Design a protein around this motif. Structure first.
Motif, mmCIF file in Angstrom:
data_model
loop_
_atom_site.group_PDB
_atom_site.id
_atom_site.type_symbol
_atom_site.label_atom_id
_atom_site.label_comp_id
_atom_site.label_asym_id
_atom_site.label_seq_id
_atom_site.Cartn_x
_atom_site.Cartn_y
_atom_site.Cartn_z
ATOM 1 N N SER A 48 0.809 -1.187 0.000
ATOM 2 C CA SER A 48 0.000 0.000 0.000
ATOM 3 C C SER A 48 0.858 1.259 0.000
ATOM 4 N N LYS A 49 0.156 2.374 -0.196
ATOM 5 C CA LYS A 49 0.619 3.713 0.208
ATOM 6 C C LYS A 49 -0.288 4.204 1.329
ATOM 7 N N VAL A 50 0.354 4.750 2.367
ATOM 8 C CA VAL A 50 -0.367 5.277 3.497
ATOM 9 C C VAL A 50 0.051 6.756 3.727
ATOM 10 N N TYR A 51 -0.942 7.569 4.086
ATOM 11 C CA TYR A 51 -0.770 9.000 4.293
ATOM 12 C C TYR A 51 -1.482 9.382 5.592
ATOM 13 N N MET A 52 -0.970 10.432 6.237
ATOM 14 C CA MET A 52 -1.712 11.078 7.306
ATOM 15 C C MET A 52 -2.146 12.431 6.802
ATOM 16 N N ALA A 53 -3.374 12.777 7.071
ATOM 17 C CA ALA A 53 -3.929 14.038 6.589
ATOM 18 C C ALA A 53 -4.636 14.749 7.751
ATOM 19 N N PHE A 54 -4.680 16.064 7.640
ATOM 20 C CA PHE A 54 -5.220 16.950 8.669
ATOM 21 C C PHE A 54 -6.305 17.774 7.991
ATOM 22 N N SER A 55 -7.361 18.062 8.748
ATOM 23 C CA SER A 55 -8.417 19.014 8.364
ATOM 24 C C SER A 55 -8.059 20.345 9.038
ATOM 25 N N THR A 56 -8.149 21.431 8.276
ATOM 26 C CA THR A 56 -7.910 22.761 8.837
ATOM 27 C C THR A 56 -9.229 23.562 8.920
ATOM 28 N N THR A 57 -10.357 22.851 8.863
ATOM 29 C CA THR A 57 -11.656 23.457 9.044
ATOM 30 C C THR A 57 -12.463 22.765 10.147
ATOM 31 N N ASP A 86 -15.481 21.867 10.217
ATOM 32 C CA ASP A 86 -16.408 20.863 9.691
ATOM 33 C C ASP A 86 -15.675 19.640 9.081
ATOM 34 N N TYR A 87 -14.364 19.543 9.322
ATOM 35 C CA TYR A 87 -13.604 18.326 9.071
ATOM 36 C C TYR A 87 -13.438 17.972 7.570
ATOM 37 N N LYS A 88 -13.281 18.989 6.727
ATOM 38 C CA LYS A 88 -12.897 18.770 5.320
ATOM 39 C C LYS A 88 -11.370 18.614 5.219
ATOM 40 N N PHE A 89 -10.923 17.689 4.361
ATOM 41 C CA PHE A 89 -9.513 17.383 4.156
ATOM 42 C C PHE A 89 -9.027 17.777 2.741
ATOM 43 N N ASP A 90 -9.372 19.006 2.379
ATOM 44 C CA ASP A 90 -9.112 19.562 1.069
ATOM 45 C C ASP A 90 -7.816 20.392 0.974
ATOM 46 N N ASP A 91 -6.991 20.386 2.014
ATOM 47 C CA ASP A 91 -5.831 21.275 2.027
ATOM 48 C C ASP A 91 -4.589 20.488 1.601
ATOM 49 N N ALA A 92 -4.059 20.780 0.394
ATOM 50 C CA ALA A 92 -2.933 20.044 -0.133
ATOM 51 C C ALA A 92 -1.727 20.099 0.754
ATOM 52 N N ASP A 93 -1.576 21.134 1.593
ATOM 53 C CA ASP A 93 -0.415 21.236 2.490
ATOM 54 C C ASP A 93 -0.570 20.382 3.768
ATOM 55 N N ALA A 94 -1.703 19.723 3.892
ATOM 56 C CA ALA A 94 -2.074 18.995 5.116
ATOM 57 C C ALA A 94 -2.083 17.467 4.866
ATOM 58 N N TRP A 95 -1.412 17.026 3.797
ATOM 59 C CA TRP A 95 -1.265 15.594 3.496
ATOM 60 C C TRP A 95 0.200 15.212 3.534
ATOM 61 N N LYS A 96 0.508 14.142 4.264
ATOM 62 C CA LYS A 96 1.891 13.677 4.369
ATOM 63 C C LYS A 96 1.930 12.181 4.032
ATOM 64 N N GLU A 97 2.725 11.799 3.037
ATOM 65 C CA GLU A 97 2.911 10.373 2.756
ATOM 66 C C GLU A 97 3.910 9.750 3.717
ATOM 67 N N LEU A 98 3.514 8.607 4.280
ATOM 68 C CA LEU A 98 4.391 7.826 5.162
ATOM 69 C C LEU A 98 5.349 6.944 4.341
ATOM 70 N N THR A 99 6.599 6.863 4.795
ATOM 71 C CA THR A 99 7.604 5.966 4.176
ATOM 72 C C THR A 99 7.593 4.636 4.911
ATOM 73 N N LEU A 100 7.044 3.638 4.236
ATOM 74 C CA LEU A 100 6.704 2.381 4.882
ATOM 75 C C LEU A 100 7.892 1.429 4.952
ATOM 76 N N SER A 101 7.959 0.707 6.052
ATOM 77 C CA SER A 101 8.838 -0.455 6.157
ATOM 78 C C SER A 101 8.264 -1.485 7.092
ATOM 79 N N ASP A 102 8.908 -2.644 7.116
ATOM 80 C CA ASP A 102 8.443 -3.745 7.916
ATOM 81 C C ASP A 102 8.713 -3.557 9.419
ATOM 82 N N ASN A 103 9.577 -2.606 9.786
ATOM 83 C CA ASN A 103 9.971 -2.374 11.178
ATOM 84 C C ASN A 103 9.345 -1.064 11.686
#
Ligand SMILES: CC1=N[C@@H]2[C@@H](O)[C@H](O)[C@@H](CO)O[C@@H]2S1
Length: 635
Positions: free
Chosen positions: A459-468, A470-487
């Motif tokens: 997979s690809k996994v991301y953490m995202a934040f709402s800056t409103t 009413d909990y909308k996640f439309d802010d491109a600066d509020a998405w971070k992709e996680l670098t995955l590993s088995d550990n």
């Protein structure tokens, strides 16, 4: 005796002799965490109420003889973590809540109350015990009220639930004094700068002794009747046999005397009823829109521990109770169930406010204790003083297809006893999310995100934040992709691009491009903070008491000086070549039930260390001291 114990008085004379600090276990028994503020976020369920409240009356602790007031070396516990739906927690078992419950509740922004229980009885002995509580000085003050307030201030809890079930001829004329006891308490608590609240059981009437109205009515309204500004009872717990008419009456009576109807908590008898299997007359307390018209009083929800065999089962059962059978706090009660999840009916709140929030999903118990993803304590524990902030929503999920199963993971964690695991067979290309926290976190140029995680292969996994709000996640600066590993890895992201904004929610987002058999991803720690510094190390660390069982096993009490940046502290022993965590506590006095050495241990002494775990999730450098056994293991 080293083990700290619950505080219990055999008589009123004994309570009148109480003084701050005059008990050998006071330093441990005090609460250490100040009551947190909370935000009430945007409603996530169309049937939820921001007015309706929930009070829990729980037997929070082990009943085992010689159980400690801080917890113990056992996983199974009432490891309560649904604070987001509670107005308050009532410590049912006694007058003075234990520090493990005060600390957990306070870190989560929930007040904790002791219980002043007068027996269901008309014995002269019980009638006298009741009358004796209401003794007055010449000036009309109540000395017992002062001691209750003094204890609340000293041990750091928020007031009392009064269960006045004693009746008879000596009781009947004492309604006025009982009411004045509560009002006086308020005056005195204000005077000593430690306000308290009272919750009052629908039992003793003003003039006629014990008689349950199942509501607020003509015989008990005086206990809620205001004195302008002040009130006797803050909260009223209505007896279990309410119905439409009784509820109508209650509302009429509260409105007439100038009280909020939602200060009346309609009792649910969960002990005889079996937790979420309890038959409730929902139609009598829900209005035309399916919304609560009074608050909810949960009698003995700790009963839920009987419904499963394991500590893992405890949390899953709590999910049914607090979230509902539909498994998502945004969803409605299933058509084939009678129970409404609390989340279906009651708005969530969040202590995740300010410039710093951290969690490692510490539920206050575990099978092991992990330190940065490595087992440190290799055995079971419950020390609820370290209980953290668990997800607001369990579990608010959306998907283009199927949804991963979200659960606590007691088999692998980053820090403490458990992480969050998201797992399942993924059937094909899917995008989905899991909305975890409601927050109100102010972002500055110095704000960073730290996220500890593991797995996610396929997979690809991301953490995202709402800056409103009413909990909308439309802010491109509020998405971070996680670098995955088995550990386990712990990654830091710069949030400076969001400076000046406010984060209102946190979610995970998963992309799978095709099928993945037994997919698994773990979230282990989440920190948003403008502080990346190690807190200062504890100072003046020593063993203040000890009791050897033999040359290989001892109890101890350690003490040190901390600092304001510390959330809680961890104490470790050096076992041969390896540091091993013993316990954790929000306090600066800590009981060690078992300091131990192996058969091969060398010498007559053994190193201990204490570490401050910051509010920003970062450990301090250790403070060390030497435990003196006075003998070798072979002597
Ligand atoms: C508050 C309440 N006080 C009483 C409890 O002490 C009893 O155990 C319970 C039995 O169902 O009934 C009411 S509820």
């Amino acid at each position: 005796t080293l083990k700290p114990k619950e505080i219990k008085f055999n008589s009123w004379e004994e309570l009148l002799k109480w003084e701050p600090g005059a008990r050998e276990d006071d330093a441990i028994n005090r609460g250490s965490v100040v009551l947190a503020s909370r935000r009430t976020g945007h409603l996530v369920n169309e049937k939820a109420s921001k007015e309706a409240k929930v009070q829990a009356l729980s037997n929070t602790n082990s009943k085992a003889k010689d159980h400690a007031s801080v917890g113990g070396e056992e996983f199974k516990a009432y490891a309560f973590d649904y604070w987001q739906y509670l107005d308050s927690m009532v410590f049912w078992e006694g007058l003075v809540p234990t520090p493990d419950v005060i600390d957990a509740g306070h870190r989560n922004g929930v007040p904790v109350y002791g219980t002043l229980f007068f027996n269901w009885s008309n014995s002269i002995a019980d009638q006298e015990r009741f009358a004796e509580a209401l003794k007055q000085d010449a000036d009309g003050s109540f000395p017992i009220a002062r001691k209750l307030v003094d204890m609340a201030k000293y041990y750091g809890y928020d007031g009392y639930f009064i269960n006045q079930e004693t009746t008879g001829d000596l009781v009947k004329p004492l309604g006025e004094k009982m009411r004045q006891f509560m009002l006086y308490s308020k005056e005195y608590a204000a005077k000593v700068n430690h306000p308290i609240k009272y919750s009052w059981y629908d039992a003793m009437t003003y003039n006629y002794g014990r008689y349950h109205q199942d509501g607020l009515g003509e015989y008990n309204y005086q206990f809620m009747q205001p004195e302008g500004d002040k009130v006797p009872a803050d909260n009223f717990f209505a007896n279990f046999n309410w119905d439409k008419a009784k509820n109508d009456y209650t509302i009429a009576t509260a409105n007439w005397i100038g009280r909020n109807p939602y200060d009346v908590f309609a009792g649910l008898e969960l002990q005889q009823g079996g937790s979420y299997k309890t038959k409730v007359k929902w139609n009598d307390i829900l209005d035309e829109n399916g919304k609560l018209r009074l608050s909810l009083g949960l009698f003995a929800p700790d009963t839920i521990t009987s419904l499963g065999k394991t500590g893992e089962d405890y949390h899953k059962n709590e999910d049914i109770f607090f979230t509902g059978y539909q498994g998502d706090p945004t969803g409605q009660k299933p058509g084939d169930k009678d129970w409404y999840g609390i989340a279906n009916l009651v708005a969530d709140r969040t202590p995740a406010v300010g410039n710093t929030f951290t969690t490692s999903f510490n539920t206050g118990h575990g099978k092991k204790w992990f330190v940065d993803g490595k087992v440190s304590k290799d055995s079971e524990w419950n020390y609820r003083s370290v209980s953290g902030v668990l997800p607001t929503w369990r579990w608010w999920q959306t998907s283009t297809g199927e949804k991963l199963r979200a659960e606590y993971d007691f088999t692998d964690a980053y820090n403490g006893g458990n992480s969050l695991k998201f797992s399942g067979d993924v059937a094909g290309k899917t995008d989905q999310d899991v909305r975890l926290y409601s927050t109100k976190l102010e972002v500055t140029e110095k704000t960073k995100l730290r996220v500890a995680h593991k797995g996610g292969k396929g997979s690809k996994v991301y953490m995202a934040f709402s800056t409103t709000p009413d909990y909308k996640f439309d802010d491109a600066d509020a998405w971070k992709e996680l670098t995955l590993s088995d550990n386990w890895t712990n990654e830091e992201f710069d949030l400076s691009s969001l400076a000046g904004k406010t984060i209102y929610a946190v979610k995970l987002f998963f992309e799978h491009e095709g099928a993945v058999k037994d997919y698994q991803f773990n979230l282990g720690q989440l920190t948003i903070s403008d502080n990346h510094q190690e807190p200062q190390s504890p100072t003046s660390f020593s063993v203040v008491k000890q009791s050897l069982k033999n040359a290989q096993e001892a109890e101890a009490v350690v003490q040190f000086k901390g600092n304001k940046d510390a959330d809680f502290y961890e104490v470790y022993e050096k076992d041969g070549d390896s540091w091993k965590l013993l316990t954790g506590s929000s306090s600066t006095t800590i009981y060690l039930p078992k300091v131990s050495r192996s058969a091969s241990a060398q010498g007559t002494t053994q190193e201990l260390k204490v570490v401050a775990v910051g509010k920003n999730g970062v450990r301090s450098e250790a403070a060390t001291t030497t435990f003196d056994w006075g003998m070798t293991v072979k002597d």
